[PDB]
Amino acid sequence: QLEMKVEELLSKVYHLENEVARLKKLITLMQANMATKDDLARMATKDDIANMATKDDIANMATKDDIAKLDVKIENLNTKMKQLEWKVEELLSKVYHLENEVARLKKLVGSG
Amino acid sequence: QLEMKVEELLSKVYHLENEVARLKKLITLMQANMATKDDLARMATKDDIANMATKDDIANMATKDDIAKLDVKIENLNTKMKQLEWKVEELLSKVYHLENEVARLKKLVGSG
Amino acid sequence: QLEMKVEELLSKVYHLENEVARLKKLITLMQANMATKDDLARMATKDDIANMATKDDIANMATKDDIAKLDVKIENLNTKMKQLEWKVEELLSKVYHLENEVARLKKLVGSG
Structure with a gap:
């Protein structure tokens, strides 16, 4: 037991x-x-x-190289603009002298 | 026990x-x-x-559509510039012929 | 035991x-x-x-301020272009009147 x-x-x-x-x-x-x-x-x-940004958030991101390419286009337009300015200045001068020459001729010719 | x-x-x-x-x-x-x-x-x-980028990092991000909009403005200025160039060329030609005509008239009139 | x-x-x-x-x-x-x-x-x-974007992914990101700076350059070229346009218009007018004056003088002078 x-x-x-x-x-x-x-x-x-x-x-x-x-x-x-x-x-x-x-x-x-x-x-x-x-x-x-x-x-x-x-x-x-x-x-x-x-607050994570994703690759999809930046899929359409412009770059510094995009900005540089536009800036080149803008500088080239500025140079073209100046070149035209200079030619317009030359022409303005030529028109002024022509006006003077024509005035003198009109004085000398009168009614003909 | x-x-x-x-x-x-x-x-x-x-x-x-x-x-x-x-x-x-x-x-x-x-x-x-x-x-x-x-x-x-x-x-x-x-x-x-x-190295995670955040939504705040990209809050001021330019896009490809911003670049396209500027490029359109630049192409339109290029076209305007060409149009002015062409008109200046026409005028340069007209001034040259006027100069020739005035020279001939001065020869023919002399001192009047 | x-x-x-x-x-x-x-x-x-x-x-x-x-x-x-x-x-x-x-x-x-x-x-x-x-x-x-x-x-x-x-x-x-x-x-x-x-799909996390990294700081290296955005290292070359253009900004809205880059776009604004280009836009200022473009607006300034537009204003210069208009100014040249206006001077070309003045000159076109002056050339037209000179042509008329010279025509009249040639009629009055003939062969001299």
């Missing part, structure tokens, strides 16, 4: 020893595979990327 | 059985709720976003 | 009590340090940043 209880206890303690050993095995496997709070500290949050 | 110790052991083993059972329950709950190393492998790090 | 087994069981149960206590300590430390599924839900994934 007492002896039965002791036998029962021997069996139950051996089974507990094994249950404890298996829990240790499991906890070990868990620790090797667990992400930690430190791990989380190295990670980007959703909030960290809430 | 022996019997007391056996009773003590019976109680202590039943309590251990329950403690072990509760630990199993807890470990189960932990495994269902644990983030894993594989989970971490799918996540973005802080380092991964260190 | 029975007494030996009981002594053995007493020792083994005390050691189990301590093993269980140490497992509880460990599990506690694990729970305090574990990242959770909720934690993972707050984190950015690699997939979330797959």
Whole structure:
């Protein structure tokens, strides 16, 4: 009777020893595979990327090279404009002298 | 006496059985709720976003459509410039012929 | 004999009590340090940043201020162009009247 209880206890303690050993095995496997709070500290949050620009946001982005190409076109038009200005100035001068010459001729010819 | 110790052991083993059972329950709950190393492998790090562009970085971005609109303005100025060039050429020609006509008249009139 | 087994069981149960206590300590430390599924839900994934624009992507970005500066250059060329147009118009008029005056003089002078 007492002896039965002791036998029962021997069996139950051996089974507990094994249950404890298996829990240790499991906890070990868990620790090797667990992400930690430190791990989380190295990670980007959703909030960290809430103001992220995407490749689609910039798909139509102009570049500094686009600006430089336009600036070249503008400088070349400025040079052409100056060249025309100079020719107009030469002509303005020639027209003024022609007007003077014609005035003199009209004085000299009168009614003919 | 022996019997007391056996009773003590019976109680202590039943309590251990329950403690072990509760630990199993807890470990189960932990495994269902644990983030894993594989989970971490799918996540973005802080380092991964260190060179991220933001929506504020691009708030003043020019576009390809801004460049196209300027280019249209530049092409239209080029056409206007050519039109003026052509009219200046016509005038240069007319001034040259007037100069010739006036020269001939001055020869024919002399001092009047 | 029975007494030996009981002594053995007493020792083994005390050691189990301590093993269980140490497992509880460990599990506690694990729970305090574990990242959770909720934690993972707050984190950015690699997939979330797959379309991220970088600071290098925008290193050559033109700005709205670059566009405004070109537009000023273009407006100023437009004004210069108009000014030249007006002077050409004045000259066209003067050339037309000179042509008329010279025609009249040629009629009046004839062969001289």
